[PDB]
PDB file of C-alpha atoms and ligand atoms in Angstrom:
ATOM      1  CA  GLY A   6     139.950 110.036  66.707  1.00  0.00           C
ATOM      2  CA  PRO A   7     138.578 111.240  63.316  1.00  0.00           C
ATOM      3  CA  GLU A   8     137.519 107.529  62.885  1.00  0.00           C
ATOM      4  CA  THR A   9     134.599 107.924  65.425  1.00  0.00           C
ATOM      5  CA  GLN A  10     132.166 110.937  65.132  1.00  0.00           C
ATOM      6  CA  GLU A  11     129.974 112.114  68.050  1.00  0.00           C
ATOM      7  CA  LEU A  12     126.194 112.455  67.205  1.00  0.00           C
ATOM      8  CA  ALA A  13     124.706 113.504  70.569  1.00  0.00           C
ATOM      9  CA  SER A  14     125.562 113.823  74.287  1.00  0.00           C
ATOM     10  CA  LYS A  15     123.744 114.351  77.636  1.00  0.00           C
ATOM     11  CA  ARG A  16     125.151 115.403  81.058  1.00  0.00           C
ATOM     12  CA  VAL A  17     123.642 114.218  84.405  1.00  0.00           C
ATOM     13  CA  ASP A  18     124.897 115.550  87.785  1.00  0.00           C
ATOM     14  CA  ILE A  19     124.400 113.286  90.853  1.00  0.00           C
ATOM     15  CA  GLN A  20     126.446 114.066  94.037  1.00  0.00           C
ATOM     16  CA  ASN A  21     130.163 114.751  93.093  1.00  0.00           C
ATOM     17  CA  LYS A  22     129.777 112.509  89.983  1.00  0.00           C
ATOM     18  CA  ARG A  23     129.260 113.836  86.441  1.00  0.00           C
ATOM     19  CA  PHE A  24     128.019 111.363  83.750  1.00  0.00           C
ATOM     20  CA  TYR A  25     128.284 112.044  80.008  1.00  0.00           C
ATOM     21  CA  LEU A  26     126.027 109.703  77.901  1.00  0.00           C
ATOM     22  CA  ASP A  27     127.368 109.929  74.348  1.00  0.00           C
ATOM     23  CA  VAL A  28     125.971 108.456  71.089  1.00  0.00           C
ATOM     24  CA  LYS A  29     128.976 107.741  68.798  1.00  0.00           C
ATOM     25  CA  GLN A  30     129.597 106.138  65.394  1.00  0.00           C
ATOM     26  CA  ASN A  31     132.558 104.510  63.534  1.00  0.00           C
ATOM     27  CA  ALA A  32     133.145 101.767  60.849  1.00  0.00           C
ATOM     28  CA  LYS A  33     131.812  99.081  63.307  1.00  0.00           C
ATOM     29  CA  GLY A  34     128.402 100.897  63.676  1.00  0.00           C
ATOM     30  CA  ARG A  35     126.667 103.083  66.339  1.00  0.00           C
ATOM     31  CA  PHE A  36     127.383 102.721  70.090  1.00  0.00           C
ATOM     32  CA  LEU A  37     126.731 104.503  73.405  1.00  0.00           C
ATOM     33  CA  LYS A  38     129.720 105.567  75.593  1.00  0.00           C
ATOM     34  CA  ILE A  39     129.055 106.446  79.257  1.00  0.00           C
ATOM     35  CA  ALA A  40     131.839 108.554  80.912  1.00  0.00           C
ATOM     36  CA  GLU A  41     131.780 108.939  84.735  1.00  0.00           C
ATOM     37  CA  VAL A  42     134.030 111.803  86.066  1.00  0.00           C
ATOM     38  CA  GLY A  43     135.061 111.242  89.723  1.00  0.00           C
ATOM     39  CA  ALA A  44     137.428 113.081  92.109  1.00  0.00           C
ATOM     40  CA  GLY A  45     140.609 114.471  90.499  1.00  0.00           C
ATOM     41  CA  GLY A  46     138.926 113.983  87.064  1.00  0.00           C
ATOM     42  CA  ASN A  47     139.420 110.195  87.170  1.00  0.00           C
ATOM     43  CA  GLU A  48     137.087 109.002  84.339  1.00  0.00           C
ATOM     44  CA  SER A  49     135.648 105.464  84.098  1.00  0.00           C
ATOM     45  CA  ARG A  50     134.027 104.302  80.802  1.00  0.00           C
ATOM     46  CA  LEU A  51     131.174 101.893  79.929  1.00  0.00           C
ATOM     47  CA  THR A  52     130.789 101.216  76.148  1.00  0.00           C
ATOM     48  CA  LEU A  53     127.500  99.647  74.866  1.00  0.00           C
ATOM     49  CA  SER A  54     126.161  98.448  71.506  1.00  0.00           C
ATOM     50  CA  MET A  55     122.769 100.135  70.831  1.00  0.00           C
ATOM     51  CA  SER A  56     121.054  96.745  71.662  1.00  0.00           C
ATOM     52  CA  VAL A  57     122.968  96.295  74.985  1.00  0.00           C
ATOM     53  CA  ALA A  58     121.945  99.961  75.811  1.00  0.00           C
ATOM     54  CA  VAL A  59     118.228  99.102  75.318  1.00  0.00           C
ATOM     55  CA  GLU A  60     118.838  96.143  77.673  1.00  0.00           C
ATOM     56  CA  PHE A  61     120.739  98.375  80.120  1.00  0.00           C
ATOM     57  CA  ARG A  62     117.981 101.012  80.148  1.00  0.00           C
ATOM     58  CA  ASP A  63     115.622  98.170  81.248  1.00  0.00           C
ATOM     59  CA  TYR A  64     118.047  96.667  83.847  1.00  0.00           C
ATOM     60  CA  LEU A  65     118.092 100.213  85.410  1.00  0.00           C
ATOM     61  CA  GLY A  66     114.262 100.162  85.155  1.00  0.00           C
ATOM     62  CA  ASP A  67     114.205  96.800  87.034  1.00  0.00           C
ATOM     63  CA  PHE A  68     116.368  98.220  89.929  1.00  0.00           C
ATOM     64  CA  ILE A  69     114.290 101.447  90.044  1.00  0.00           C
ATOM     65  CA  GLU A  70     111.168  99.224  90.435  1.00  0.00           C
ATOM     66  CA  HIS A  71     112.898  96.680  92.738  1.00  0.00           C
ATOM     67  CA  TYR A  72     115.836  98.422  94.482  1.00  0.00           C
ATOM     68  CA  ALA A  73     115.393  96.922  98.000  1.00  0.00           C
ATOM     69  CA  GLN A  74     114.402  93.419  96.727  1.00  0.00           C
ATOM     70  CA  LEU A  75     117.506  93.344  94.397  1.00  0.00           C
ATOM     71  CA  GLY A  76     119.837  94.764  97.158  1.00  0.00           C
ATOM     72  CA  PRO A  77     122.209  92.460  99.110  1.00  0.00           C
ATOM     73  CA  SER A  78     120.343  90.117 101.599  1.00  0.00           C
ATOM     74  CA  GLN A  79     120.946  90.990 105.337  1.00  0.00           C
ATOM     75  CA  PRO A  80     123.532  88.767 107.152  1.00  0.00           C
ATOM     76  CA  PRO A  81     122.636  85.985 109.674  1.00  0.00           C
ATOM     77  CA  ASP A  82     122.086  87.195 113.291  1.00  0.00           C
ATOM     78  CA  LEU A  83     124.362  85.380 115.849  1.00  0.00           C
ATOM     79  CA  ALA A  84     121.074  83.496 116.769  1.00  0.00           C
ATOM     80  CA  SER A  85     121.072  90.024  95.111  1.00  0.00           C
ATOM     81  CA  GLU A  86     123.036  88.443  92.145  1.00  0.00           C
ATOM     82  CA  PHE A  87     122.046  90.205  88.871  1.00  0.00           C
ATOM     83  CA  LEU A  88     124.152  88.907  85.951  1.00  0.00           C
ATOM     84  CA  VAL A  89     123.556  88.673  82.147  1.00  0.00           C
ATOM     85  CA  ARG A  90     125.677  86.438  79.847  1.00  0.00           C
ATOM     86  CA  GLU A  91     125.433  86.569  75.984  1.00  0.00           C
ATOM     87  CA  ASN A  92     127.036  83.851  73.735  1.00  0.00           C
ATOM     88  CA  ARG A  93     128.810  82.462  76.901  1.00  0.00           C
ATOM     89  CA  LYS A  94     131.494  85.232  76.300  1.00  0.00           C
ATOM     90  CA  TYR A  95     130.033  88.699  77.201  1.00  0.00           C
ATOM     91  CA  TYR A  96     128.977  89.421  80.846  1.00  0.00           C
ATOM     92  CA  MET A  97     127.179  92.352  82.461  1.00  0.00           C
ATOM     93  CA  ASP A  98     126.877  92.425  86.298  1.00  0.00           C
ATOM     94  CA  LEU A  99     124.907  94.984  88.393  1.00  0.00           C
ATOM     95  CA  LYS A 100     125.184  95.066  92.222  1.00  0.00           C
ATOM     96  CA  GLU A 101     124.145  97.539  94.979  1.00  0.00           C
ATOM     97  CA  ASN A 102     126.918  98.798  97.366  1.00  0.00           C
ATOM     98  CA  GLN A 103     124.593  99.494 100.393  1.00  0.00           C
ATOM     99  CA  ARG A 104     127.305 101.590 102.182  1.00  0.00           C
ATOM    100  CA  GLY A 105     127.672 103.922  99.149  1.00  0.00           C
ATOM    101  CA  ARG A 106     123.986 103.794  98.071  1.00  0.00           C
ATOM    102  CA  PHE A 107     125.626 103.015  94.642  1.00  0.00           C
ATOM    103  CA  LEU A 108     124.666 100.600  91.857  1.00  0.00           C
ATOM    104  CA  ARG A 109     127.911  99.134  90.430  1.00  0.00           C
ATOM    105  CA  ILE A 110     127.736  97.960  86.770  1.00  0.00           C
ATOM    106  CA  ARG A 111     130.643  95.907  85.267  1.00  0.00           C
ATOM    107  CA  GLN A 112     130.880  94.669  81.655  1.00  0.00           C
ATOM    108  CA  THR A 113     133.573  91.978  80.928  1.00  0.00           C
ATOM    109  CA  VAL A 114     134.486  89.390  78.199  1.00  0.00           C
ATOM    110  CA  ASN A 115     135.822  85.854  79.131  1.00  0.00           C
ATOM    111  CA  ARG A 116     137.805  83.699  76.584  1.00  0.00           C
ATOM    112  CA  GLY A 117     140.238  77.993  79.650  1.00  0.00           C
ATOM    113  CA  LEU A 118     142.879  80.607  80.688  1.00  0.00           C
ATOM    114  CA  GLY A 119     142.386  83.338  78.062  1.00  0.00           C
ATOM    115  CA  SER A 120     143.147  86.934  79.292  1.00  0.00           C
ATOM    116  CA  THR A 121     140.838  90.059  79.101  1.00  0.00           C
ATOM    117  CA  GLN A 122     139.754  92.964  81.441  1.00  0.00           C
ATOM    118  CA  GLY A 123     136.670  95.266  81.181  1.00  0.00           C
ATOM    119  CA  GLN A 124     134.692  98.357  82.194  1.00  0.00           C
ATOM    120  CA  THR A 125     132.971  99.625  85.387  1.00  0.00           C
ATOM    121  CA  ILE A 126     130.795 102.625  86.440  1.00  0.00           C
ATOM    122  CA  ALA A 127     128.893 103.236  89.739  1.00  0.00           C
ATOM    123  CA  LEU A 128     125.619 105.264  89.742  1.00  0.00           C
ATOM    124  CA  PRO A 129     124.456 106.978  92.949  1.00  0.00           C
ATOM    125  CA  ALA A 130     121.051 105.413  93.769  1.00  0.00           C
ATOM    126  CA  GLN A 131     119.513 108.950  94.056  1.00  0.00           C
ATOM    127  CA  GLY A 132     120.273 109.660  90.322  1.00  0.00           C
ATOM    128  CA  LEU A 133     119.025 106.295  88.910  1.00  0.00           C
ATOM    129  CA  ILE A 134     115.727 107.725  87.525  1.00  0.00           C
ATOM    130  CA  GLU A 135     117.511 110.789  85.985  1.00  0.00           C
ATOM    131  CA  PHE A 136     120.366 108.661  84.506  1.00  0.00           C
ATOM    132  CA  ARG A 137     117.852 106.198  83.056  1.00  0.00           C
ATOM    133  CA  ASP A 138     115.615 109.021  81.674  1.00  0.00           C
ATOM    134  CA  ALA A 139     118.666 110.506  79.908  1.00  0.00           C
ATOM    135  CA  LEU A 140     119.698 107.066  78.561  1.00  0.00           C
ATOM    136  CA  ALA A 141     116.090 106.428  77.319  1.00  0.00           C
ATOM    137  CA  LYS A 142     115.867 109.845  75.493  1.00  0.00           C
ATOM    138  CA  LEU A 143     119.118 109.022  73.590  1.00  0.00           C
ATOM    139  CA  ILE A 144     117.748 105.595  72.511  1.00  0.00           C
ATOM    140  CA  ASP A 145     114.402 107.177  71.320  1.00  0.00           C
ATOM    141  CA  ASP A 146     116.345 109.583  69.103  1.00  0.00           C
ATOM    142  CA  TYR A 147     119.306 107.558  67.949  1.00  0.00           C
ATOM    143  CA  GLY A 148     117.863 104.272  66.840  1.00  0.00           C
TER     144      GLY A 148
ATOM    145  CA  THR B  30      95.523  86.514  91.805  1.00  0.00           C
ATOM    146  CA  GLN B  31      93.461  88.390  89.088  1.00  0.00           C
ATOM    147  CA  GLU B  32      93.708  87.899  85.230  1.00  0.00           C
ATOM    148  CA  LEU B  33      93.864  91.468  83.746  1.00  0.00           C
ATOM    149  CA  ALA B  34      94.421  90.432  80.063  1.00  0.00           C
ATOM    150  CA  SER B  35      95.496  87.582  77.726  1.00  0.00           C
ATOM    151  CA  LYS B  36      96.590  87.127  74.064  1.00  0.00           C
ATOM    152  CA  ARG B  37      96.994  83.913  72.028  1.00  0.00           C
ATOM    153  CA  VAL B  38      99.712  83.429  69.366  1.00  0.00           C
ATOM    154  CA  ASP B  39      99.310  80.333  67.084  1.00  0.00           C
ATOM    155  CA  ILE B  40     102.623  79.058  65.584  1.00  0.00           C
ATOM    156  CA  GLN B  41     102.445  75.617  63.877  1.00  0.00           C
ATOM    157  CA  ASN B  42     100.578  73.064  66.114  1.00  0.00           C
ATOM    158  CA  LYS B  43     101.452  75.123  69.288  1.00  0.00           C
ATOM    159  CA  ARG B  44      99.488  77.940  70.959  1.00  0.00           C
ATOM    160  CA  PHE B  45     101.077  80.477  73.403  1.00  0.00           C
ATOM    161  CA  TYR B  46      98.893  82.315  75.935  1.00  0.00           C
ATOM    162  CA  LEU B  47     100.432  85.614  77.227  1.00  0.00           C
ATOM    163  CA  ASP B  48      98.487  86.714  80.344  1.00  0.00           C
ATOM    164  CA  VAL B  49      98.972  89.785  82.562  1.00  0.00           C
ATOM    165  CA  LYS B  50      98.168  88.813  86.197  1.00  0.00           C
ATOM    166  CA  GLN B  51      98.084  90.886  89.482  1.00  0.00           C
ATOM    167  CA  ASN B  52      98.690  89.787  93.146  1.00  0.00           C
ATOM    168  CA  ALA B  53     100.336  91.059  96.412  1.00  0.00           C
ATOM    169  CA  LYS B  54     103.991  91.453  95.224  1.00  0.00           C
ATOM    170  CA  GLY B  55     102.942  93.150  91.907  1.00  0.00           C
ATOM    171  CA  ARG B  56     102.071  92.386  88.227  1.00  0.00           C
ATOM    172  CA  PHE B  57     103.573  89.426  86.323  1.00  0.00           C
ATOM    173  CA  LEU B  58     103.394  87.794  82.880  1.00  0.00           C
ATOM    174  CA  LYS B  59     102.340  84.088  82.729  1.00  0.00           C
ATOM    175  CA  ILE B  60     103.345  82.493  79.393  1.00  0.00           C
ATOM    176  CA  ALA B  61     101.770  79.062  78.727  1.00  0.00           C
ATOM    177  CA  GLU B  62     102.609  76.919  75.634  1.00  0.00           C
ATOM    178  CA  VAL B  63      99.814  74.410  74.765  1.00  0.00           C
ATOM    179  CA  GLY B  64     100.747  71.480  72.460  1.00  0.00           C
ATOM    180  CA  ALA B  65      98.446  69.418  70.214  1.00  0.00           C
ATOM    181  CA  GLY B  66      96.942  67.254  73.047  1.00  0.00           C
ATOM    182  CA  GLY B  67      96.710  70.188  75.514  1.00  0.00           C
ATOM    183  CA  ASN B  68     100.037  69.496  77.333  1.00  0.00           C
ATOM    184  CA  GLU B  69     101.043  72.874  78.903  1.00  0.00           C
ATOM    185  CA  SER B  70     104.451  74.331  79.742  1.00  0.00           C
ATOM    186  CA  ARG B  71     104.275  77.573  81.845  1.00  0.00           C
ATOM    187  CA  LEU B  72     106.717  80.486  82.508  1.00  0.00           C
ATOM    188  CA  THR B  73     105.919  83.291  85.047  1.00  0.00           C
ATOM    189  CA  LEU B  74     107.969  86.537  84.847  1.00  0.00           C
ATOM    190  CA  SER B  75     107.764  89.822  86.791  1.00  0.00           C
ATOM    191  CA  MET B  76     106.858  92.727  84.434  1.00  0.00           C
ATOM    192  CA  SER B  77     110.515  93.971  84.816  1.00  0.00           C
ATOM    193  CA  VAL B  78     111.865  90.646  83.459  1.00  0.00           C
ATOM    194  CA  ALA B  79     109.022  90.604  80.865  1.00  0.00           C
ATOM    195  CA  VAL B  80     110.542  93.919  79.530  1.00  0.00           C
ATOM    196  CA  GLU B  81     114.084  92.386  79.522  1.00  0.00           C
ATOM    197  CA  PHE B  82     112.529  89.380  77.678  1.00  0.00           C
ATOM    198  CA  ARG B  83     111.020  91.716  75.028  1.00  0.00           C
ATOM    199  CA  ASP B  84     114.543  93.141  74.440  1.00  0.00           C
ATOM    200  CA  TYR B  85     116.135  89.627  74.248  1.00  0.00           C
ATOM    201  CA  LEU B  86     113.502  88.632  71.603  1.00  0.00           C
ATOM    202  CA  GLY B  87     114.456  91.640  69.388  1.00  0.00           C
ATOM    203  CA  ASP B  88     118.055  90.323  69.491  1.00  0.00           C
ATOM    204  CA  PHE B  89     117.009  86.716  68.660  1.00  0.00           C
ATOM    205  CA  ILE B  90     114.848  88.178  65.780  1.00  0.00           C
ATOM    206  CA  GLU B  91     117.845  90.207  64.393  1.00  0.00           C
ATOM    207  CA  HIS B  92     119.850  86.914  64.411  1.00  0.00           C
ATOM    208  CA  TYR B  93     117.001  84.775  62.863  1.00  0.00           C
ATOM    209  CA  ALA B  94     116.349  87.438  60.083  1.00  0.00           C
ATOM    210  CA  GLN B  95     120.136  87.661  59.102  1.00  0.00           C
ATOM    211  CA  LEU B  96     121.057  86.523  55.564  1.00  0.00           C
ATOM    212  CA  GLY B  97     123.713  83.706  55.498  1.00  0.00           C
ATOM    213  CA  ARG B  98     128.087  89.026  67.389  1.00  0.00           C
ATOM    214  CA  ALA B  99     124.355  88.061  66.875  1.00  0.00           C
ATOM    215  CA  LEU B 100     122.627  86.608  69.994  1.00  0.00           C
ATOM    216  CA  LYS B 101     122.722  82.730  70.009  1.00  0.00           C
ATOM    217  CA  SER B 102     122.213  82.290  73.841  1.00  0.00           C
ATOM    218  CA  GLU B 103     121.237  84.611  76.739  1.00  0.00           C
ATOM    219  CA  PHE B 104     121.533  83.812  80.474  1.00  0.00           C
ATOM    220  CA  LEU B 105     120.011  86.024  83.257  1.00  0.00           C
ATOM    221  CA  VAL B 106     120.552  85.335  86.973  1.00  0.00           C
ATOM    222  CA  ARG B 107     118.038  87.488  88.915  1.00  0.00           C
ATOM    223  CA  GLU B 108     117.421  86.984  92.661  1.00  0.00           C
ATOM    224  CA  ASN B 109     116.802  83.217  93.281  1.00  0.00           C
ATOM    225  CA  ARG B 110     116.175  82.578  89.519  1.00  0.00           C
ATOM    226  CA  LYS B 111     118.068  81.745  86.299  1.00  0.00           C
ATOM    227  CA  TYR B 112     116.637  82.078  82.727  1.00  0.00           C
ATOM    228  CA  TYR B 113     118.320  80.333  79.750  1.00  0.00           C
ATOM    229  CA  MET B 114     117.357  81.355  76.163  1.00  0.00           C
ATOM    230  CA  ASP B 115     118.916  79.301  73.394  1.00  0.00           C
ATOM    231  CA  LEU B 116     118.225  79.857  69.692  1.00  0.00           C
ATOM    232  CA  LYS B 117     118.532  76.149  68.723  1.00  0.00           C
ATOM    233  CA  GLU B 118     118.674  74.608  65.189  1.00  0.00           C
ATOM    234  CA  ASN B 119     117.712  71.038  64.294  1.00  0.00           C
ATOM    235  CA  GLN B 120     116.901  69.817  60.699  1.00  0.00           C
ATOM    236  CA  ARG B 121     113.090  69.869  61.507  1.00  0.00           C
ATOM    237  CA  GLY B 122     113.391  73.636  62.394  1.00  0.00           C
ATOM    238  CA  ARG B 123     114.939  76.578  64.289  1.00  0.00           C
ATOM    239  CA  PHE B 124     113.263  77.411  67.636  1.00  0.00           C
ATOM    240  CA  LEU B 125     113.931  79.495  70.785  1.00  0.00           C
ATOM    241  CA  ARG B 126     114.090  77.434  74.046  1.00  0.00           C
ATOM    242  CA  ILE B 127     113.566  79.264  77.380  1.00  0.00           C
ATOM    243  CA  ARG B 128     114.367  77.364  80.631  1.00  0.00           C
ATOM    244  CA  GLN B 129     113.530  78.799  84.081  1.00  0.00           C
ATOM    245  CA  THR B 130     115.196  77.287  87.210  1.00  0.00           C
ATOM    246  CA  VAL B 131     114.696  78.621  90.764  1.00  0.00           C
ATOM    247  CA  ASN B 132     117.070  78.324  93.795  1.00  0.00           C
ATOM    248  CA  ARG B 133     114.956  76.713  96.596  1.00  0.00           C
ATOM    249  CA  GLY B 134     117.403  77.822  99.402  1.00  0.00           C
ATOM    250  CA  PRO B 135     121.074  77.211 100.413  1.00  0.00           C
ATOM    251  CA  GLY B 136     122.216  73.519 100.085  1.00  0.00           C
ATOM    252  CA  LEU B 137     119.012  72.606  98.070  1.00  0.00           C
ATOM    253  CA  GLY B 138     120.493  73.631  94.633  1.00  0.00           C
ATOM    254  CA  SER B 139     117.775  74.634  92.076  1.00  0.00           C
ATOM    255  CA  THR B 140     114.608  73.044  90.461  1.00  0.00           C
ATOM    256  CA  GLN B 141     114.894  71.719  86.808  1.00  0.00           C
ATOM    257  CA  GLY B 142     111.833  74.019  86.151  1.00  0.00           C
ATOM    258  CA  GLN B 143     109.384  74.453  83.226  1.00  0.00           C
ATOM    259  CA  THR B 144     110.628  75.005  79.610  1.00  0.00           C
ATOM    260  CA  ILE B 145     108.892  76.727  76.602  1.00  0.00           C
ATOM    261  CA  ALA B 146     110.137  76.280  72.998  1.00  0.00           C
ATOM    262  CA  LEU B 147     109.104  78.947  70.471  1.00  0.00           C
ATOM    263  CA  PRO B 148     109.289  78.106  66.741  1.00  0.00           C
ATOM    264  CA  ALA B 149     111.472  80.878  65.176  1.00  0.00           C
ATOM    265  CA  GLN B 150     108.671  81.731  62.635  1.00  0.00           C
ATOM    266  CA  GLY B 151     106.520  83.004  65.611  1.00  0.00           C
ATOM    267  CA  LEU B 152     109.229  85.074  67.510  1.00  0.00           C
ATOM    268  CA  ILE B 153     107.992  88.344  65.840  1.00  0.00           C
ATOM    269  CA  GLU B 154     104.238  87.646  66.540  1.00  0.00           C
ATOM    270  CA  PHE B 155     105.119  86.495  70.097  1.00  0.00           C
ATOM    271  CA  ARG B 156     107.355  89.548  70.697  1.00  0.00           C
ATOM    272  CA  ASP B 157     104.622  91.844  69.213  1.00  0.00           C
ATOM    273  CA  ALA B 158     101.943  90.376  71.587  1.00  0.00           C
ATOM    274  CA  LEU B 159     104.322  90.730  74.597  1.00  0.00           C
ATOM    275  CA  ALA B 160     105.174  94.372  73.706  1.00  0.00           C
ATOM    276  CA  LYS B 161     101.426  95.197  73.410  1.00  0.00           C
ATOM    277  CA  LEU B 162     100.631  93.808  76.924  1.00  0.00           C
ATOM    278  CA  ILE B 163     103.696  95.585  78.375  1.00  0.00           C
ATOM    279  CA  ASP B 164     102.484  98.887  76.753  1.00  0.00           C
ATOM    280  CA  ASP B 165      98.884  98.352  78.024  1.00  0.00           C
ATOM    281  CA  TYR B 166      99.802  97.037  81.589  1.00  0.00           C
ATOM    282  CA  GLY B 167     103.558  97.656  82.450  1.00  0.00           C
ATOM    283  CA  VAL B 168     105.390 100.183  84.747  1.00  0.00           C
ATOM    284  CA  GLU B 169     109.350  99.986  84.677  1.00  0.00           C
TER     285      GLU B 169
HETATM  286 MG1   MG C 229     127.216  92.774  77.485  1.00  0.00          MG
END
């Protein structure tokens, strides 16, 4: 609320989706919040450390360079996986929905049968370069 | 396949060659660790993964530099490949181990694959060399 202050923000418009890339700050340090605004104003959030954001900028870079090769392999005629794990706990997954022309990104934490849920955005493939450019500009300026 | 550029980083008895190479598919980074009798271990990365690898090294360096949430292990599954990066400690020294395995098809599992082990003292030098070849020869 008044705990976290906002330092900077960028808006990117791709199809009917609006993304806000925010640089924010609290007691715990500086982080990057991505807000996606869908139909009916349904927001989904992705929240990144400044080091995971650097990584994420480059994962987007990888897909931009390699979008078809990293897409889902065609099925068998009648005759892909992109996952990052850190300290065996924190997961980030990126996967193309070919029907949507979307890149789905999920961040989760696993803790045996411990409980936890996580965070998911989907980026139209036609706004990948623009999203990534905006993300990169915020990293250049906000350490 | 053409050798565009190389750099050598010397860390204890080991030497690490970082080479940019070019072929059909695109540019890659060959890393090759040479021990005291010339035994080689080799790692080949696309430039995209080389860039990811640069970022992982910054994180290992933040952990190594800490006095007394910091990256201890990183795993990346990308296409038919897995990469395992483990900041290991023994009493003889701290080092970063990097294992590559590759999936050789359905039902075949994956190859044990070649391993490099980077003494922690040389992470910064190694990262600096990598970053310089990415700047001079990378795309992303
Ligand atoms: Mg993560």
